[PDB]
Amino acid sequence: HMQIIHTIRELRTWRENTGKVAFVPTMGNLHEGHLALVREARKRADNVVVSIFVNRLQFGYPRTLQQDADKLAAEGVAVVFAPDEKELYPNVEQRYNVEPPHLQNELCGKFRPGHFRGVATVVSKLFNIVLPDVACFGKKDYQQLAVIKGLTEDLNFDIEIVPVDTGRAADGLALSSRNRYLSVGERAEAPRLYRELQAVAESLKQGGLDYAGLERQAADHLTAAGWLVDYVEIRRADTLEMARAGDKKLVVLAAARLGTTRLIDNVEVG
Template structure:
């Protein structure tokens, strides 16, 4: 496995490679990330994983400085799953001058997670665009846990005519159902025990909808009240069309229920898809 720190090194490595899979990450890798790598390996000759904590997708007061950076441990995990190359640039490598050119996603960027994280999706789309230009992959794998991000990246690739197939990979979960996330490490022991409740609520909503309940507003309000009275601070809990990410209508046949909530100081996100 090659460890590459500069764009020049990556492009030299890439030059004689054919079919490339790509997994962009911010490091602190867990089994969810490794699932993305394994999916990419099924479909390509070589897999590149980037490890880069992207400053322009963090807002004021967010955890950019404290975000866990565990490069040595990450490399060990990637060697074990047979990654061909790791691209781990410094900030000055990707942003040698102030960034004045950005990818501006659709208005979906201001909803859901974007409502409280202004500029987040613009920053994420911009860095992914940079990484696509550098790596020039044939496919790229993203986790469905970040459903809104996956939607925005697919939209960007389609709108900008990029010759890249975007693959959404099912959310990796702990045995108790908690969606795997680097931020799970922020949870206290007591909070970690409580955290799977968010996914259980999503499963209950899924079951109710599959059984014919289409009063989405009422059921989501009840679930939100339950969480808020049991130690959570719900940021949003919404039913959306999985195709458009617009608010769900009764006639929609492919839905996604998306949630973001804080447990203590830790912000958790999750979602569940429903096909009627």
């Protein structure tokens, strides 16, 4: 049933003659958050391609290839595309890169320079390899989602980009591999991130207009509780353009560290 394909030539050979394709790009180490992407994908096309590739160009990491394909076989995945580095980067350098706008240096990008350029570039390469009709990305990595929506529009990729809802724990914590780094005490404290975002969201829903004050209060509550806050920001939904007074479709985003571990989350408000 399911095929494991490692070369661009074999992937293209398989994809021709096939109809609609839904595509889920990942870096492996698959968990429940990823399966949400896969399940939504399978609701949109009979042929689901999942890519597993770790990208030297977006790092600042485990493999477990055998376990990954087993989790996906159960979910009706047609093809797992897992090329090696040289397959995608046959020369050392990547000479032609997809260059994001200034968004790449904001929010998470301020402490991950080059990261979103690397994401945009490898996703463009993957789009040109798989030629998908639909591609699923999770709302938890909102800035990544905006960059991928932006490159899709600006480069005329004929691909429907499908945001997939953030899976959360029972206590509200957004599911992420990063959670495994948290000590027992930190994991009990970790749900405060989502709680503060929701409180910002309620203030906005209740006519609150002081964006900067709301961000600071959320940051102050996190800091006082032991977090090291990277940012809390209110921006326009989908595009992450600056939030303007009177905007009705907004998103609150935050990134903050408990010890050595950085957590991110966000809440959309309408």
